[PDB]
Design a protein around this ligand. Structure first.
Ligand SMILES: O=P(O)(O)OC[C@@H]1O[C@H](COP(=O)(O)O)[C@@H](OP(=O)(O)O)[C@H](OP(=O)(O)O)[C@H]1O
Ligand SMILES: Nc1ncnc2c1ncn2[C@@H]1O[C@H](COP(=O)(O)OP(=O)(O)O)[C@@H](O)[C@H]1O
Ligand SMILES: [Mn+2]
Ligand SMILES: [Mn+2]
Ligand SMILES: [Mn+2]
Length: 275
């Protein structure tokens, strides 16, 4: 019905207009959504209607992706082998901002993960934290990870930081679709069509797509949709340069592994469909 309905039961605010939602405007994300409305990927992303001012602040006016659904179930998949910009690596070398928050979350999961010096600092750099998160989740090996589920019963979970193996990921999707063969078939048809759109997209070949998600939405009526969201760290390649989006990331090459992730994700859902 609406995301803000769920929020009621961060960067998001209720829109006055029916079927819309407001997201705090960021310069890279605004640039991206404007381009995407004219791209092959137009139908694979939420409609972007422009910017509005609320309480002296700028908001993206977006399609509420939950609007067409009756009690939506939602799963957010973070796409890519890398979840931070290469510029974070330069910043942490020349002028590191030590992060005490990130030390704590790391310590909780693996007490032996932090180095002697990180333990002494009670702090880690952002790229160290984000690379560690990639390796204990499925990000590094499979090129995506499950971040969160919101269920029709009102329940939500973010308990997926150690969801890493192909079979662990399959079991989360298995629980998410609750044996609805029609929802799974529709998800797979939509992911196949998104992959085809990404492989021909002018936007996609010319942009490093970091920190974006695939939002899976379904309901008890067997309606099922998937969209790309979150273009806050999606940046153009300089001087008409392109990515293949499959080859491994090496600092300098700006590769995101986006399609390595999507390939693996389709493979897992195709496997689940045959179980
Ligand atoms: O390991 P988790 O607790 O699941 O998530 C860690 C956070 O991940 C964010 C992205 O992931 P998201 O798009 O929010 O899923 C980071 O944001 P940006 O990349 O937009 O800057 C945020 O960074 P910072 O604002 O510097 O603290 C991290 O602290
Ligand atoms: N257009 C949308 N319609 C409905 N829900 C949305 C929409 N965009 C984002 N969301 C919800 O908000 C969550 C966070 O979105 P995201 O764009 O990643 O924001 P952030 O930049 O704060 O991480 C998603 O996982 C989803 O539940
Ligand atoms: Mn996000
Ligand atoms: Mn965020
Ligand atoms: Mn963002």
């Amino acid at each position: 019905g609406s995301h803000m309905s769920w929020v009621q039961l961060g960067s998001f605010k209720a829109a006055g207009t029916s079927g819309l939602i407001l997201k705090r405007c960021s310069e890279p994300e605004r640039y991206c959504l404007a381009r995407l409305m004219a791209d092959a990927l137009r139908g694979c992303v939420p409609a972007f209607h422009g910017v509005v001012e609320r309480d002296g602040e700028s908001y993206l006016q977006l399609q509420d992706l939950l609007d067409g659904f009756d009690g939506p179930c939602v799963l957010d998949c973070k796409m890519g082998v890398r979840t931070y910009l290469e510029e974070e690596l330069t910043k942490a070398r020349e002028r590191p901002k030590l992060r005490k928050d990130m030390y704590k979350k790391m310590l909780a999961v693996d007490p032996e993960a932090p180095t002697e010096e990180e333990h002494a600092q009670r702090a880690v750099t952002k790229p160290r934290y984000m690379q560690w998160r990639e390796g204990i989740s499925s990000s590094t090996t499979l090129g995506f990870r499950i971040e969160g589920i919101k269920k029709a019963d009102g329940s939500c979970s973010t308990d997926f930081k150690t969801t890493r193996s192909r079979e662990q990921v399959l079991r989360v999707f298995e629980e998410f679709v609750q044996g609805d063969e029609e929802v799974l078939r529709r998800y797979l048809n939509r992911l196949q069509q998104i992959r085809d759109t990404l492989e021909v997209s002018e936007f996609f070949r010319r942009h490093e797509v970091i920190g974006s998600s695939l939002l899976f939405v379904h309901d008890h009526c067997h309606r099922a949709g998937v969209w790309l969201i979150d273009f806050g760290k999606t940046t153009p390649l300089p001087d008409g340069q392109i990515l293949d989006h499959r080859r491994p990331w090496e600092e300098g090459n700006r590769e995101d592994g986006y399609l390595l992730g999507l390939d693996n994700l389709i493979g897992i859902l195709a496997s689940l469909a045959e179980r």
